[PDB]
């Protein structure tokens, strides 16, 4: 069974206006099999709109392409993002961790999604007791984009609720 197509697709912004379907494809085929690759153009002038999308055969190929950023395509550094589920942030809310979840629990799990810069375990302003939720800040948005499309997150035995934090 194939992963849903929406999860295999990358928005590429910031294209050179000279990038074509063919040159975008030739670039991004370095990181996997592309089932689709389109530069968006004006319907009348055919002038590029400066963005496009590519679709890989598998999510692991999407990961490989994102891990190979920065991408310089036809001389210009472009901006790939996974398709929306774009609210582009580097921080997540992690709920449901209760009072026994510590920093190392959160770090050991989330470090495999991206490079962590801040872990904030929330405590009561008056008593200092743990409130049962936390924020994790990464150095880049793709970590968050991978995290929030998962159906489940299990950390320290708890089924957690994870969302983008703004």
Q: Which domain holds residue 136?
A: 91-164
Residue 114: exposure state from Cβ atoms within 10 A (0-12, 13-18, ≥19): buried
How far is it, in rounded angstroms, from Cα 57 to Cα 61? 7
Structural method: X-ray
Under a CB-based contact definition with an 8 Å cutoff, are residues 90 and 140 in contact? Answer: yes
How far apart CA 59 and CA 68 sit, in angstroms, is: 14
Q: How many domains does the chain have?
A: 2
How far is Cα 132 from Cα 159, in angstroms, rounded to an integer? 12
- Strands (E) in 23-115, as ranges, are 34-41, 48-56, 72-73, 76-77, 79-82, 91-95
**Residues 134, 107 within the same domain:** yes
Cβ count near 93 (within 10 Å): 17
Same domain, 130 and 69: no
C-alpha to C-alpha distance for 59 and 63, rounded to whole angstroms = 6
Rounded alpha-carbon distances, angstroms, from residue 20 to 15, 37, 44, 49: 9, 9, 16, 11
């Amino acid at each position: 069974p194939k992963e849903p197509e929406q999860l295999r697709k990358l928005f590429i912004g910031g294209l050179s206006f000279e990038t074509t379907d063919e040159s975008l494809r030739s670039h991004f085929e370095q990181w996997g099999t592309l089932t689709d690759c389109v530069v968006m153009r004006d319907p009348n002038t055919k002038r590029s709109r400066g963005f496009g999308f590519v679709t890989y055969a598998t999510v692991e190929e999407v990961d490989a392409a994102m891990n190979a950023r920065p991408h310089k395509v036809d001389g210009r550094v472009v901006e790939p993002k996974r398709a929306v589920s774009h609210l582009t942030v580097k921080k997540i809310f992690v709920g449901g961790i209760k009072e026994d979840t510590e920093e190392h629990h959160l770090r050991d799990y989330f470090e495999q999604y991206g490079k962590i810069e801040v872990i904030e375990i929330m405590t009561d302003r008056g008593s200092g007791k743990k409130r049962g939720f936390a924020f994790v800040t990464f150095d880049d948005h793709d970590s968050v984009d991978k995290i929030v499309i998962q159906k489940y997150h299990t950390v320290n035995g708890h089924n957690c609720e994870v969302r983008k934090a703004l």
